[PDB]
């Protein structure tokens with residue numbers, strides 16, 4: 001409705017005041033009760049999900065500011081991309097991520113690139129450039145004490161509602177803006193991925209969800225607030241698994257907006273969960289990786305959440321663009337070589353243009369004191385969007 005005022009997607013909802021659902025919110029019904037039927041409908045539903053997530057847990061994601069400039073220099077195989085961002089009131093900030101390049105002549109369209117939060121914790125293949133993004137400089141994340149601290153808040157104000165992770169997304173968007181105006185950086189901006197581990201894996205999922213120029217999203221052991229769902233983690237903690245949950249996470253750090261504090265004890269009233277956050281990546285590609293050795297990561301919750309998110313890619317006819325691999329037997333953020341073929345399949349297909357198959361959806365089912373029962377959490381039947 002109201003397309004004449006708001007555009008093709010109408011008056012998408014940012015709140016659902018009467019919502020109360022203990023199970024996972026239905027991806028395929030808009031807030032107004034209209035069922036999704038076409039692939040085009042997904043674009044609008046994703047925009048509504050973005051608004052809902054910003055309202056309930058992420059805070060406001062600002063658009064591109066009026067000033068974004070960049071200069072580039074290189075020494076050896078390391079480039080420095082010096083970025084300036086500024087508002088209409090003259091306020092500016094600056095940040096200078098670095099890029100590690102493969103040696104020699106690049107492909108005709110430039111190097112594919114992975115934006116790695118704090119360097120990431122995945123092995124990046126030799127033909128892919130790595131941009132090291134200091135997300136912690138953009139928004140600090142030491143503890144609750146970090147609220148409103150970081151470069152983002154030196155531009156927008158320390159009381160701006162963006163969570164630290166939303167501020168990090170904004171920084172990624174400025175990085176891509178900078179790359180698109182800097183041909184001497186020799187990056188194929190159509191082949192950009194994002195990755196991070198642990199808290200930075202929560203961040204990488206947010207970046208891929210909200211920044212549609214990211215071709216491949218790779219969250220690694222992101223846990224609660226990442227590829228786990230709030231509702232499923234509450235079920236886990238109530239049944240004796242020592243998981244991180246919504247109640248604890250908002251007191252531990254600043255990864256979510258202060259408004260989320262009003263909902264952490266009332267999760268059924270939140271008209272989204274992280275299966276919808278992950279689904280915002282669709283129709284682009286994502287594979288996330290989890291580790292069952294650490295109950296803190298909420299293992300069942302990640303498998304259930306990603307199974308629910310997967311229905312969106314299934315409904316869009318592109319199930320193999322979304323992967324999930326969950327194993328045990330290795331230290332947190334150590335990369336197990338057993339998962340390298342799955343990681344490389346996604347990188348090879350979606351960043352390197354190879355004909356790799358990407359059907360990866362596996363778990364060991366080692367969930368501790370709970371089990372995953374899909375019928376207890378997923379109530380919708382996946383439509384074939386036209």
Ligand SMILES: *[C@@H]1O[C@H](CO)[C@@H](O)[C@H](O)[C@H]1NC(C)=O
Nearest residue numbers: 001009010011012030032034
């Ligand atoms: C329901 O909301 C969606 C998203 O704003 C919109 O595309 C759709 O047209 C709405 N339905 C009606 C009947 O207006």
